[model samples]
Target: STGSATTTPIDSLDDAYITPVQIGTPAQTLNLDFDTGSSDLWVFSSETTASEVDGQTIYTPSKSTTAKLLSGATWSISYGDGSSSSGDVYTDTVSVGGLTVTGQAVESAKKVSSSFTEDSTIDGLLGLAFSTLNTVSPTQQKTFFDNAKASLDSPVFTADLGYHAPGTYNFGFIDTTAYTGSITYTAVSTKQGFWEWTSTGYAVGSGTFKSTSIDGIADTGTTLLYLPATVVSAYWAQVSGAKSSSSVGGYVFPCSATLPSFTFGVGSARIVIPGDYIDFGPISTGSSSCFGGIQSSAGIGINIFGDVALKAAFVVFNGATTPTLGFASK
Candidate 1:
């Protein structure tokens, strides 16, 4: 038998998908962000100071009969968005969907940065990247998927992210019914603990597809699609009234500007991003300006195919031998 789960977008913030997960004996359920960019199943917990928690729900390990402290163990992580968290470690039974793994290392947050504290909807993060990226000192920990994969009928997972709507994350099996067309497969390099791949080319609107190569990672935690500065500049050049803003950071344009569809290439296949999805919404309430969801990947080593890009397709993170990525229309 295989295990699977689905996630929904939280109210107000369509930037992330939150899924239900159970940890410890008596089953303390938490709504966690399924992040493909990092590794570490860290959550707000009893260890976190009350003042630091704000409106976020916390995991209380003391209430769980199966929870055990991993003496002297600790972890910390920083994200591209500047959000961070750190905490001690505990060993407990972790369950997702209907699958459960014993002895999974659950990092309980003792300290969290303002970004996390201010975000009340997300209680924790479920890291889906390689286990090697786990930050626990002295001994690294395996991700929930890493521990559960061996028992799955197959080593595959699918991410079907929808814009402002609930989507499904299937584990151990591919639901052919969830996607359309042939699933274009590409080799991935996991040396960096991310689903890193290269795009053969891309095109703006209905223009010709360029043959330029772009190396990038598929990151679910990120809210926008980040490309090279040159690429970002090219896209904005076609938009009237688009300008860089020092106050808003990145590029912003008149809210009524017509946005052309952006297309990304993979092998001989192309994934098209609708123009409506490009407008990231108002910079502030009742403002005439809106931010472009596609921005420059400057400073960051590689481009990030974040939520904005992933939601346009059905993505498969194949963990089988050689590790390949599959994309198709949803």
Candidate 2:
């Protein structure tokens, strides 16, 4: 009824995290990005264009007796960077962590963008968000979580992302041993098909907390934490050498500068993101300036509490009739 899996950061930059997943009857394993920001389980496959296929593992439907073409169904997903992948759809026995779902939609990529082919760290993406965001046309399919939730003892999942370390993703039940203190629960709005929640306010270092209402999404798919321009500027101002420059990217500071920790309030709980995390890493090798993990969300339209924020605490995405989110210090 409950299961868990270890997810590891892809590279030294901690740009993304990946979890091993088993798909098809013969059980082909692939390292996939378990994204909570979208809803479509797609993969690099034998159907992908030869030029687009690089060192990534490919899912071959012909190798699985359980695979069946969904006939006439197709899917496509575009990312913020303009990179995208489109494919034909099939149903198969798919498993993640230890939870298995029969007749799960397994999208086979027939076309891919330059960005998708360049990264050899991931074979594809396993969407954990609501299936309402599924890209399959004519008939939308349920996500791996959606299909497995029915058989789970509890309809919830928890994400504990790490900084330069491996993390865990739990299905069905929360791991009591994973966190400390107490959990602060908040009502979640699924209006935008995201784990949308409102934050009480934020603070830079130990500075005074601003009483600003920030509506944001806890998106594991995103790499950095993006907040309103006002909030970002306030945080960056605390660092002596910090500058908001579009040339070298936003919020870059002297590598030697001691950065301050950032904190955001959820309900009555305040989760703090460490200074080292905000420092991110050097913009270029041997460069004296490092890029900030927190950036302005002015162009993004919505604030995003991405990996930089999520890794600071234990996050629970409750798939209840009335959806909710829970945050706990760890």
Index of the highest-lDDT prediction: 2
| Model 2 misplaced regions, further than 4 Å | none
**Candidate 1 ranges beyond 4 A from true positions:** none
Candidate 1 lDDT: 0.88
Please give the lDDT score at residue 183 for candidate 1. Answer: 95
lDDT (10s digit) by residue, model 2, range 121-222:
899999987889999999999999888888999999999998889999999998889999898999888998889999999999989888778999998888
Taking all chains together, the TM-score of candidate 1 against the true structure is 0.97
TM-score of each: 0.97, 0.98
User: Over the stretch 129-213, how does candidate 1's per-residue lDDT look in tens digits?
Assistant: 8888999998999998888888888888888988878888888888989988989999899999998999888898888888888
